[PDB]
Design a protein around this ligand. Structure first.
Ligand SMILES: Cc1nc(N)cc2c1CNC(=O)c1cnn(c1)Cc1ccc(Cn3cccn3)cc1OCCC/C=C/CCO2
Length: 231
């Protein structure tokens, strides 16, 4: 997250960290807990070698440095990458993860409600870079960013097709955005006093540049797919 600040315990209780354990262990992507046994993330998080039994999913965590061998984690039972996703391309950047065991809902880990509206009060969170050529951040970062219309987003990225299945968010003069390592995490907005998952963090040209909004997978346009794959 560029231009954000530190979050607090329980503030974003659906945020998870997707890590890979090889000799060393590292955070690769964010995700959103959507049910006891389901996490939503970005398909591109799985672009690397499809190694077996390396992923560890951490929920109810604030600081990456607090993770040790005794910290509990979830494991992957199944990865469901959207069938039409293609590597190095934007469309359908979405994946479901079924966990090996159901997680309990607590004060510190709870699901984000899925969307069924002009959203105000939208936030993006994660442990990604705080600047374009940066590094993973230790404490979960948060930033408040306005949505832009798809017509405006398309005007900013005339070199790509911004589809109705994407949603964009950014400031005209930049400075606040998601970045590398935030991929797969949530873009949440308020409605009726309740948080809803509006987007999955996907892409931008650079990070936080003026007139270059972040591009997110628009969750509402994947609800039929989510319901089909989870039932
Ligand atoms: C979350 C995030 N935010 C920003 N601002 C930048 C980020 C990021 C982090 N995002 C990634 O690193 C990343 C890797 N693959 N992808 C994203 C998929 C992707 C999505 C969209 C597009 C362009 N497009 C827009 C509409 C249609 N197409 C391209 C994609 O992949 C090509 C390679 C992506 C490289 C990204 C480097 C910078 O990464």
């Amino acid at each position: 997250i560029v231009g954000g600040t530190e979050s607090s315990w329980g503030e974003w209780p659906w945020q998870v960290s997707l890590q890979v354990k090889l000799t060393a262990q590292r955070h690769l992507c964010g995700g959103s807990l959507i049910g006891h046994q389901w996490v939503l993330t970005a398909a591109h998080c799985f672009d690397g070698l499809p190694l077996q039994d390396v992923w560890r999913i951490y929920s109810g965590i604030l600081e990456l440095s607090d993770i040790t061998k005794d910290t509990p984690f979830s494991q992957i039972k199944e990865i469901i990458i959207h069938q039409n996703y293609k590597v190095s391309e934007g469309n359908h950047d979405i994946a479901l993860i079924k966990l090996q065991a159901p997680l309990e809902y607590t004060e510190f880990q709870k699901p984000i409600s899925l969307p069924s509206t002009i959203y105000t009060n939208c936030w993006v969170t994660g442990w990604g870079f705080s600047k374009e050529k940066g590094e993973i951040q230790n404490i979960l970062q948060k930033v408040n960013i306005p949505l832009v219309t798809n017509e405006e987003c398309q005007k900013r990225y005339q070199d790509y097709k911004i589809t109705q299945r994407m949603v964009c968010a950014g400031y005209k003069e930049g400075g606040k955005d998601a970045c590398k390592g935030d991929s797969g995490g949530p873009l949440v907005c308020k409605h009726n006093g309740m948080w809803r998952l509006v987007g999955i963090t996907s892409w931008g040209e650079g990070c936080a540049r003026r007139e270059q909004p972040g591009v997110y997978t628009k969750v509402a346009e994947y609800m039929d797919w989510i319901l089909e794959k989870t039932q």
